[PDB]
DNA sequence: AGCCGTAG
DNA sequence: AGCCGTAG
DNA sequence: GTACCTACGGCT
DNA sequence: GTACCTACGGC
């Protein structure tokens, strides 16, 4: 992959390492090729501090730029054989580019410390802004980043080589505690010290992954991919009661407009929410390909379709009622929202899982009769116990059904937002003939690969692991449902091997309950209380600001009515008015001063067409006004009291409970 | 490998099912009785049999895993008795490409596995239309439709003559293109399946298709539909040169969906190309970041790169909104897309072809557009004109990458008969460097030559020692110095002797083998110069024709309202008192339409005119535009009372685009 | 172990 | 003999 | 995140 | 038409 330079002198020779083939070609074509080398990295590279050497000298990338450099490593290091004496990191200005630029300067310091010491690795600064290097032309590429007389590189120092074994250990090791202890107490939520280049770049990394990636709001349940998959299905109109558009649009549409980053984390994030195996209250609706449980992919987005389901609707529902804030999306040329309404409790009802940096997420989901419930108790007593909660809400509801195994784990959850949820299969023992018995599993647990737990059955069998099982299939149907047969040798126990099964397979799993969510904006770990706590914080702040939004537009609404109502009942005088002005701007003069009517009036009156003076017009202007004073005053009632206020949430809820709660899937059997 | 296998280890009552990947195999698996029917997934386009030498056929992958499959070994180790199903199917997608690939996989099994059809094992599946892959469908429709024993339609193959079927999988599938081409000329129309009626009907609904909606331009705007696809959905998303770019993934979700039911990489190489300056004569496409070079680097991926149309490509679009050019439905007729642009600039010829088809191919070089232009212009003042004559405006070809052509006997040849060989050479010269030596320097190479690989070529050379003289091989290309190759000569050897040979043993020189084949009224045609002129100049009279028709209704149209809201304001008062005096909007019409002579559209316009259109400065507003419309519709009906004005204004708009976007000859034709 | 799911 | 450009 | 199989025809 | 790399954390 290098494309090397021609001068054969290391003295005046430069290797830039970019970040994307995308940006490689663009800096080839850009560069000075006498003096400049191009080697192109794909994507992230291996976290050498946290990998065995065997792993590091087999990786592509790595080998690459060893053999590039021509110094060795480690103890073989010899810096007068170094190919250029400038190693340039030229990475995108976000934070992917920042995590990149960690990840190189860690293998740099760890295998080639000297070359560093010696003042020949570099940071470019391309300019920010821009997608990625991807987006540049080669002529800007080679003006502002790689061009010596006008580009602004960094030299990476090094000051203290304790200072930055300990930074390096902390930052990129294997103990993930220092690191989440380094974020919490860090986060605001010509030349280059490495120590501080290692911190501010991994710190904007770790709080980019926290805050907008990896973890779920706790009012809307959402990660940015997904609130920006629903939001691009409501701007496109894409509602349950539209034909299904075909998923290249959709995603499309959201790349450009809100998500800037690649197709498939898109596509892949919008095909879970269609998976009744994922979403325990799917958020699209599907038509095509879209996976199984034993982990075969989606169809590729050019054969599916997709649209809303009618539970996302109350997602979105008064989102544009001002309920929420909208912010600017990445480039300034669109708005998207911070939060949807969630007019159901989302984030409990189809849970969460992430993986982010210096922690985690592992919400399972809850059947949303049980929660609204809850919510209905809490919303009547703020002091509920945990336990009195646990009365509405059993445990999780898997979308996959099963068993859990009693309720230590699920209370343990609930009351410090950490514990172990024993899942098990549904599984019975039945006769198939002659005296002989099989096991039949017909739930599985949630998360788990059905393919890859039978696989697992076979190997034990294979390897002699597990006595008593001669035959394994899938009768897996669509008129079945999920059918796992194992058959059981004549006279062996059945109860027996089912028990060992459980022990030996995914036919028992545990769920580890990690409920962390973002708070106002900071991750934090959560109990049940809590969670339901912010979401009625929420449901109220969103049905007030609904209120004043529709109070404020009837009252304007009322107010454009009136000056309608003067120019109907004095039409030969505005008509008149008009006629005898030459623009415009006097028309809008004379009719305010002569009717004592206000700019919006003025303007509304003008812009009225001639087929509004019929005259059952006159009459439905006055029906309109009444019925809009009478609205009026039904609003001020609710802003008047929070307990009118808060009524009307609870009978929200309810109404939502009867058209979507739906029945337990999963049994909550005694331990 | 791949094979999803059924239970039953019974062959008499078990099926496998090739369908063409995961895309469709997903569905199917989710649709499949597992107890009897297994899936092996293809991974697209399978081996020609009949074009291939056997090691490769034995090596292929998706070959070796059907054999393995069906158990049955091949050709002369065949055994029947051995077969692990009693039924193979044929699930191929249901569109042309699903056809094609049903040729192949038949040419397989009758080459290879012969007596498994004469058996009645193969079967064909008749999965439903409309549907671009099963991918597509929900596996509940797969199973109930197409896989299900009670309600399928299943065609067994049926072999009736041997001498019969060896020639028909000659000839279709065979080397010999001509036989193919006399059959396709012969046929095209511009329970039970006897295997010769399903290759001959499949291999022409595929060869047609390719012929007339793929490989081939429209001898009208120089078009493919892929292409025409992209334009339009440039033009229909408003992707003006006045306007940002937009992300490639825009464009590209846009003309999948709605216009090009094919991979998301066709659409997007394609308008790759269009945005090349060493590709097209004259972008059709203005991108920005990493569009690819001339050593054969791709375009990053679509989400780096953004794109809109060249001021150029306004030319092609220029009154597709003026009922110019016929509409047709798309793909599913949920859309309308053009036949063909309007395509002000002889689009053809400007920016040339290549293209693959089946039975043919073309091969259509770039030309400049000063010199078309030019000729187009002659053309139009002597029907007559030779292509001698038409040679004093058209010299030869104008490559985007320069070059020379020597001389002018080729050039000739391919403007009178279609076809000619057109010898290509790269612009070199001989420069001292100091002390006594010499080197060649390249500084254009020839249209669609990999630079890159041009100099491995040369490096090959130089290493296996083919050929002498050569002390040093340089890229040294620049944004700064354009194209500069440079090949260092040792001391006193002869560097004119150097490149003769550099161009008889490695791509600095190349031929270009004419071949101009366009659709003619939708049919493949070998057309000369002035054959494609005439075809160009007819649809631009046509155009500008049907053009001045449409302004013309459309501004009669307008300005019969505009006489209707001149009668509205000459009696300003009557109209307010008729429409005060009725109850509802249709009474007030219908009064209107008695009392003032108007028809329904003037009635319904007063009735829409803003109380603002009263003002001064809006009444005179309705008088100006009534004045002008007449004026143009006076010189409208002027253009279509003579041919010869007509005509004229052809010219006229011909020699506006020569004069704006006319540029240099770049390529040197040498005698 | 290697899995879950958003990232390059 | 392998390249070119729309296709699976 | 990126790369390599396949068809197809006509040049070399 | 699709197959292999990486970070990140907790079990
Ligand atoms: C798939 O299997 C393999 C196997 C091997 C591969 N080796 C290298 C690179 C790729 C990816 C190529 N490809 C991905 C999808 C992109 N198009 C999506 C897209 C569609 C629509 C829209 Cl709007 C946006 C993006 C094109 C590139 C491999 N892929
Ligand atoms: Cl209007
Ligand atoms: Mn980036
Ligand atoms: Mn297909
Ligand atoms: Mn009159
Ligand atoms: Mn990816």
């Known amino acids: 992959k290098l494309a090397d330079c021609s001068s054969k002198s290391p003295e005046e020779c430069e290797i830039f390492l970019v970040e994307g083939d995308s940006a490689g070609g663009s800096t080839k074509s850009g560069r000075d090729s006498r003096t400049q080398a191009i080697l192109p990295l794909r994507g992230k590279i291996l976290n050498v501090e946290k990998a065995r050497l065997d792993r590091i000298l087999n990786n592509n990338e790595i080998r690459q730029m060893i053999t590039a450099f021509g110094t060795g490593i480690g103890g073989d290091f010899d810096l007068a054989k170094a190919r250029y004496h400038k190693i340039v990191i030229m990475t995108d200005a976000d934070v992917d580019g920042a995590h990149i ?55 990476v120092k090094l000051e203290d080589a304790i200072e930055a074994d300990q930074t390096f250990e902390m930052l990129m090791g294997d103990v993930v505690e220092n690191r989440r202890q380094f974020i919490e107490d860090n986060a605001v939520y010509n030349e280059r010290n490495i120590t ?43 509602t349950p009661d539209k034909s299904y558009k075909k998923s290249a649009r959709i995603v499309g549409d959201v790349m450009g407009k809100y998500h800037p980053h690649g197709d ?35 169809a590729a987005m050019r054969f599916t379709e997709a649209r809303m389901t009618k539970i996302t609707l109350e997602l979105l529902r008064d989102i544009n009622k001002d309920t929420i804030d909208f912010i600017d999306n990445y480039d300034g040329n669109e708005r998207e929202p911070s939060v949807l309404p969630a007019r159901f409790p989302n984030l409990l009802a189809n849970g969460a899982s992430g993986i982010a940096v210096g922690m985690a997420t592992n919400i399972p989901p809850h059947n949303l009769t049980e929660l609204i419930n809850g919510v209905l108790s809490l919303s009547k007593n703020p002091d509920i116990s945990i336990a009195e909660l646990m009365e509405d809400i059993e445990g999780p509801d ?16 609930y009351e410090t937002g950490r514990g172990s949820i024993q ?9 198939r003939g002659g005296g002989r018995q099989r096991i039949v599993v017909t739930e599985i647990p949630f ?55 459980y022990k ?16 106002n904006g900071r991750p934090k770990l959560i109990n049940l209380k809590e969670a339901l706590v912010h979401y009625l914080e929420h449901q109220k702040t969103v049905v007030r600001r609904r209120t004043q939004y529709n109070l404020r537009k009837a009252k304007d609404r009322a107010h454009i009515l009136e000056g309608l109502r003067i120019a109907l009942d004095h039409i030969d005088e505005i008509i008149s008015t008009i006629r005898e002005s030459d623009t415009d701007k006097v028309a809008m003069e004379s009719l305010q001063q002569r009717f004592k009517l206000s700019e919006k009036q003025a303007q509304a009156i003008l812009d009225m067409r001639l087929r509004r003076l019929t005259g059952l017009e006159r009459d439905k202007i006055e029906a309109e006004y009444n019925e809009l004073l009478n609205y009026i005053s039904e609003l001020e009632a609710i802003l008047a009291d929070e307990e009118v206020l808060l009524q009307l949430v609870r009978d929200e809820l309810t109404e939502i409970r009867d058209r979507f709660g739906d029945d337990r899937r999963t049994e909550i059997q005694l331990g």
Do not use: C
């Open 101 to 155: 630029r960690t990840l190189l300067l860690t293998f740099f310091y760890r295998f080639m410390r000297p070359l560093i010491e010696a003042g020949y690795v570099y940071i470019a600064q391309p300019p920010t802004g821009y997608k990625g290097l991807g987006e540049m032309n080669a002529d800007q590429l080679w003006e502002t980043t790689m061009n010596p007389e006008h580009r602004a590189l960094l030299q």
């Open 196 to 238: 501080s280049e290692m911190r501010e770049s991994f710190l904007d990394y770790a709080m980019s992954v926290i805050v907008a990636r990896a973890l779920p709001d706790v009012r809307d349940g959402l990660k940015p991919v997904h609130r920006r998959i629903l939001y691009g299905l409501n701007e496109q109109g894409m």
């Open 423 to 431: 899942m098990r299969s549904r599984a019975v023992i039945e006769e």
């Open 447 to 501: 998360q788990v690969n059905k393919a890859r737990m039978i696989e697992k059955i076979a190997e034990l069998v294979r390897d002699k692991k597990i006595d008593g099982i001669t035959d394994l299939r899938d009768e897996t149907s669509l008129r079945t449902g999920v059918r796992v047969v194992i058959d059981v040798r004549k006279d062996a126990n059945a109860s027996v091997i089912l028990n060992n099964l």
């Open 504 to 519: 030996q397979t995914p036919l028992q799993t545990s769920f580890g309950v990690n409920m962390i969510a973002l708070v």
């Open 398 to 413: 898997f979308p996959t059904a099963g068993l859990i195994l009693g309720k230590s784990g699920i209370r343990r959850a």
């Open 264 to 298: 498939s984390s898109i596509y892949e994030a919008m095909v879970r929410m269609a998976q009744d195996f994922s979403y325990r209250y799917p958020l699209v609706d599907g038509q095509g390909n879209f996976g199984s449980m034993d982990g075969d992919g989606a």
